[PDB]
Design a protein around this ligand. Structure first.
Ligand SMILES: OC[C@H]1O[C@@H](O[C@@H]2[C@@H](O)[C@H](O)[C@@H](CO)O[C@H]2O)[C@H](O)[C@@H](O)[C@@H]1O
Ligand SMILES: OC[C@H]1O[C@@H](O[C@@H]2[C@@H](O)[C@H](O)[C@@H](CO)O[C@H]2O)[C@H](O)[C@@H](O)[C@@H]1O
Ligand SMILES: OC[C@H]1O[C@H](O)[C@H](O)[C@@H](O)[C@@H]1O
Ligand SMILES: [Mg+2]
Ligand SMILES: [Mg+2]
Lengths: 731, 744
């Protein structure tokens, strides 16, 4: 067993060698000296194999390395960005996506992924919303579990199973002004009821590692916050793994303003941080700290032990080359089967935001633009229409970017012999040339040249007037989201929005195919564009999936996991909000002396859980099996859902709960369950949810996790706004 | 003795009479005469007129069983009839003496008219210019906000409220109400205890410390409990930590609003309120309708009721109302104390002192002559005054002027007419409506602030303004908010000058005539376009009843503007919240390096406000020498002096607000990059110099640490002094636990 092995190995180690197990730098000489615990961001089974060989056969103790990478939403086969993927509301698909990525990365030498990112955010200004699963902690927790299980399986024993890392612990999504890395501040009540569940869920699914976040919490950088890293993570949740810092998280504490390198390094290890990504604070200062009594041997041994336990659990003491099969890349990476899975999952992620009836032939009843049969002349216009490198999305560091088909390319393939695909760039990404450059960093250039916006527009209107339909491929470049990609405006960029206006003015039918990493402020578009399909960033096979949606091969079923506000002045806007002492009643905007603004109502443009289909769904009244239950009972909430339209398709039936009265104020609703059903036209299904006191608990004023007696409102519907309702009492 | 008298009085009262002292209906609430007869009423508010107040007091004294006199409340916020600037504007004076004076005058007038209690000062810290109630406070900063709280309470109450022109003040809104989410009024507040004490609480404390007689509970939740039911707030902090000896009143229907908050029925929330330390029920009738049943049922004890009742009675005793219930009911005072020339003269001085000159660039008026700033200018020729704020009397006082005679204030045109008669012709055009949307204009101009928007087209209004402008030598563009675009329940998600006014502005600028933007506002606005295109921008906030004359004083150079901002002006609403006393983060963007990938910064704008905290210009300029510290190392027992030479390097005499900032460089918790720790407002003639000195003592360097202990920690500090929070000179010093006791 493990304990004996690790005792024995640790009894042989110098203080230096124990310290070295905590170092995760950016080298061959470092490894020879036992100064390296793992490496990260190295791609290639050949390279990784040789570096491992150096560790195993050229270091004193032969201790093998962890190899980390950001395998976020795929290795080479790119699934949608996680925010888009969350919109599937399909935990099976989500697990599959993480399984596939793990198969691919492990085939290439990777034993550790810095995934899943589970940070709750209600601030769409923050670029890293693209990497999470929205604003809701329940959905977030379900997804966390599915991702950890996809990567790790049961116990990481297989050679296609890798170690996961829940990030970023904790509260990183609440950075002030939506500005990446900025100050976080909240009450402990808010932490537990509104932000912490996804981290806890990952821990409880047996995630092997946790990454400390960049932000402060209660005035202490997370990386030096013992309350977080010991009392909560270990003390409350029982985490038995190790904590890794984020990139230079230790030395950044110097800038935060809590001390010099040695001081903040000691505080981090004493807080419960075990591995030091890049900063070399542990390597360069811990021995001195140990000599001065600032860090005990016991603390060092604990951190070292954790690191070694992770390597044992990965099977790296049994076989250091477990993940270095030179034969596997050809078999496992970027296969047709994987790419087909990604295409399917991509089409499942898209959210149909709008699809109004339009006068398409004179005299006929108006009908929607989507789906349509690929015939005639299909214009595909905009700066996202013919970009390969912008399809996979941010955080695709192992992808071959210029290998993904552009939207034009993919649609051309899919329509060969049936229709003509007419392309026009239409506009730049944005008017400001310097913004376009930083927005298209990391190889996402759109090849901006000297053609002016006016020239670009004029070409596009020429093409548009030769067309039977216009697909406007607009929105963000993929690096307008991700890290250090915060925005103060959330519009479709200026020149693109002008292009869209002008395309609408041709009189031809226009479908907005919207690429984004975040919620955008779309009131103008919701008013004037007949059809809007949010395609997020669908992955390496996005172009094909977009075709599947457009041509009706897939009926869109995605639902939003994050509120789309009307303007930036409404931030933060989220569905699970408190009622206030002065709630504005429905339809009463504007009312003086209620909680409301002078210039806009309180509502998002599109609420949490919103998503349309090519069919329609109708809900009966909710049947509750009990009107009362006690603290040990249960009941069933049933509703019949009928496909009332003409298309087969899926519906995410959503369960919300309102605790009507509380000893503290309680949100107007909370997501507490969901089921994704598929129905043929005319077919019905009775959807049943179990409700029990376990589900009705929350963290009260004293942070006690408790369900209080009183009345509850159970709400079931097609989104967080449009619901059927009923009540019961807890005794 | 007060204790004897109140014991004796409380020994006579029934449970219904004790409960009745806790009840505060609104009049000016049903069946008030009969409720007073029954002893069911402890106070009233919103009744104006010393005649009416005396009648009702006589009812209480002569026709209730026990004759217990009433408190009479009103929102005396920035004046009774003589209106001073709105408090946010007033705060830009950086002048505590003037602030105290404004409060003294308002107390003199209010008390003349029967009023014994003002629901002032509002001291809520806010970093969010969306929130309309920023107009009512004194900006983002706790140091300045604390000093203002003190000055206001002292102004209203004096030493001990003994005089018949001193009234009881009420610090509001306890607590954290300025952090409402989305800047939407009444919305959820949430923050750490550390943030509360370091960043929000001090001005409430400074009001308690100044002897404020009462505190008003806020509308917001704190830690998921409505403030009105938050025992931690109303007992543990207010009494347990600060030793507040007064009483707590709810805000309007605060108790019954807890039903909507979602913590129970009227009886439950009323019981929880009184048990929390709330002493008086504004309007809800929660206390009067449910407290006896609660006492029967054991939900509230007789000791809790007695404690609340006693606080109300002690307030009345401390105000001198048992001694003379008609102390403030002198029917002859109104004719000699209210809206007097002496009061109005002070209001005009204080108003001119509140204005903030945001921009005043050189303009070439005529070829061959060197360019000069538009401000100030001698009144000559043809002066156009154009805009929806140009000829509105009723919008001059500002929001929260509930006792003012709105349509007696001169409009800006009228004011400029009087001041320039015989010297210049004032030409006038409306130019635009307040905003394109009529329904918005309506809600924006409620409470008697109509601009009398008519059925003219935007074209009619604009063309009339252009005919004026093209005949004029200078254009005074009177634009911005109506007064009721700020105040309570006036939150905005856009902070621009409204659409049709900004179009008007553009068109006036296109004439080529020189334009001065005289900006009326209750809040920070997003003014990047205006800062780029308008030569001169004078922020006049809302100046009060004498605003028009004060504006003339500034434009013509009778007063040199010396206001400084107390709240950050963002470049856009997507930067909110933006405040000077922020943390460094782990990845600070170095100055001048926007944009840099992997630093804390946005893709589309830099991190900076358009105008920072403490920003403001003058008709002259001031230069700062380097800082001289009297010593470089002290210990906890010591002190040092920071000194800077400030010189008037321009051609005009003028006042400068010299501002002291301190940065605690390293902490056990992260510390802000600076915090205001002092200021001095100096007046300098052209060429003149003055050495400004600040005492720095370890007690000023204290903050609430992780464990909420108010401590100073040894380490390095940076002393910064300058003309605003951005443009500062620097010097460093070290604090130790133990240093030299003598020179050796
Ligand atoms: O005048 C007492 C307090 O009144 C509050 O303003 C109320 C408002 O909350 C209520 O909706 C309307 C209903 O007509 O009456 C106003 O007076 C203010 O929040 C307090 O600052 C003020 O002291
Ligand atoms: O790849 C490991 C972790 O890296 C962080 O992103 C860093 C960024 O913080 C740093 O400035 C640049 C330096 O080029 O490298 C990136 O890797 C991410 O925040 C983590 O999520 C990631 O797991
Ligand atoms: O239009 C001129 C004036 O008319 C009325 O006297 C209004 O009360 C006033 O606000 C306005 O300035
Ligand atoms: Mg309940
Ligand atoms: Mg320090």
């Amino acid at each position: 067993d493990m304990d004996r092995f690790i005792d024995a190995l640790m009894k042989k180690m110098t203080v230096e060698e124990k310290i070295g197990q905590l170092n995760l730098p950016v080298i061959a000489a470092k490894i020879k000296r036992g100064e390296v615990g793992g490496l990260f961001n190295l791609k290639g089974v050949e390279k990784i194999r040789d570096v491992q060989k150096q560790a195993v056969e050229q270091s004193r103790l032969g201790i093998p390395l962890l190899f980390g990478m950001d395998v976020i939403h795929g290795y080479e086969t790119m699934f949608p960005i996680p925010l888009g993927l969350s919109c599937t509301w399909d935990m099976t698909a989500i697990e599959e996506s993480a399984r596939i990525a793990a198969i691919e990365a492990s085939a290439d030498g990777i034993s550790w992924t810095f995934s899943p990112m589970v940070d709750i955010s209600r601030d769409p200004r923050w670029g890293r919303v693209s990497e999470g699963s929205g604003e809701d902690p329940f959905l977030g927790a379900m997804i966390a579990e599915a991702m950890v299980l996809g990567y790790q399986g049961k116990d990481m024993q297989r050679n296609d199973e890798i170690m996961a890392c829940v990030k970023h612990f904790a509260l990183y999504g609440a950075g002030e002004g939506g500005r990446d890395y900025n100050t976080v501040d909240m009450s402990r009540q808010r932490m537990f009821n509104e932000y912490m569940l996804p981290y806890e869920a990952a821990v409880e699914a047996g995630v092997g590692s946790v990454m400390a976040s960049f932000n402060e919490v209660d005035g202490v950088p997370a990386t030096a916050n013992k309350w977080l890293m010991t009392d909560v993570l270990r003390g409350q949740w029982g985490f038995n793994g190790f904590v890794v810092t984020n990139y230079t998280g230790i030395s950044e504490m110097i800038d935060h303003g809590i001390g010099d390198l040695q001081t903040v390094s000691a505080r981090a290890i004493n807080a419960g941080v075990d591995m030091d990504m890049v900063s070399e604070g542990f390597v360069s200062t811990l021995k001195k700290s140990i000599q001065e009594g600032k860090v005990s041997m016991e603390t060092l041994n604990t951190a070292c032990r954790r690191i070694l336990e992770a390597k044992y659990k990965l099977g790296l003491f049994d076989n250091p080359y477990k993940y270095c099969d030179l034969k596997r890349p050809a078999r496992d990476i970027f296969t047709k089967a994987h790419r087909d899975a990604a295409r399917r999952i991509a089409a499942e992620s898209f959210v149909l935001l709008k699809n109004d009836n339009v006068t398409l032939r004179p005299g006929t009843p108006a009908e929607p633009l989507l789906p349509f049969n690929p015939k005639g002349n299909i214009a595909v216009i905009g700066p996202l229409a013919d970009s390969r490198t912008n399809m996979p999305g941010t955080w695709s560091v192992a992808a071959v970017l210029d290998r993904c088909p552009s939207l034009v390319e993919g649609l051309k393939e899919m329509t060969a012999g049936k229709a003509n695909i007419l392309y026009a760039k239409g506009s730049n990404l944005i008017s400001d040339a310097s913004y376009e450059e930083r927005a298209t960093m990391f190889g996402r250039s759109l090849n901006r040249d000297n053609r002016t916006d006016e020239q670009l527009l004029n070409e596009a209107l020429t093409v548009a007037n030769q067309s039977d339909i216009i697909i406007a491929a607009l929105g963000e470049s993929s690096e307008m989201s991700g890290e250090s990609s915060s925005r103060t405006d959330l519009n479709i960029p200026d020149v693109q929005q002008n292009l869209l206006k002008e395309l609408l003015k041709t009189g031809k039918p226009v479908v907005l195919v919207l690429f984004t990493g975040r919620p955008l402020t779309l009131t103008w578009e919701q008013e004037h564009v007949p059809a809007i399909l949010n395609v997020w960033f669908g992955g390496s096979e996005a172009a094909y999936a977009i075709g599947d949606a457009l041509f009706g091969y897939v009926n869109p079923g995605g639902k939003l996991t994050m509120s789309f506000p009307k303007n930036v002045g409404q931030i933060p806007l989220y569905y699970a909000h408190k009622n206030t002492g002065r709630p504005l009643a429905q339809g009463k905007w504007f009312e003086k002396f209620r909680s409301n603004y002078l210039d806009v109502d309180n509502e998002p443009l599109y609420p949490f859980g919103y998503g349309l289909s090519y069919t329609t769904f109708s809900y009966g009244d909710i049947d509750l099996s009990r009107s009362t239950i006690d603290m040990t009972g249960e009941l069933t909430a049933a509703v019949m859902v009928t496909n009332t339209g003409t298309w087969p398709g899926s519906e995410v039936v959503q369960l919300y709960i309102r605790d009507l009265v509380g000893s503290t104020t309680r949100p107007v609703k909370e997501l507490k369950g969901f089921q994704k059903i598929f129905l043929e036209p005319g077919q019905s299904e009775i959807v049943r949810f179990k409700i029990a006191p376990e589900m009705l608990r929350y963290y009260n004023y004293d942070l006690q996790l408790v369900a209080e007696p009183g009345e509850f409102e159970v709400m079931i519907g097609t989104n967080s706004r449009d619901v059927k309702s009923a009540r019961f009492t807890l005794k």
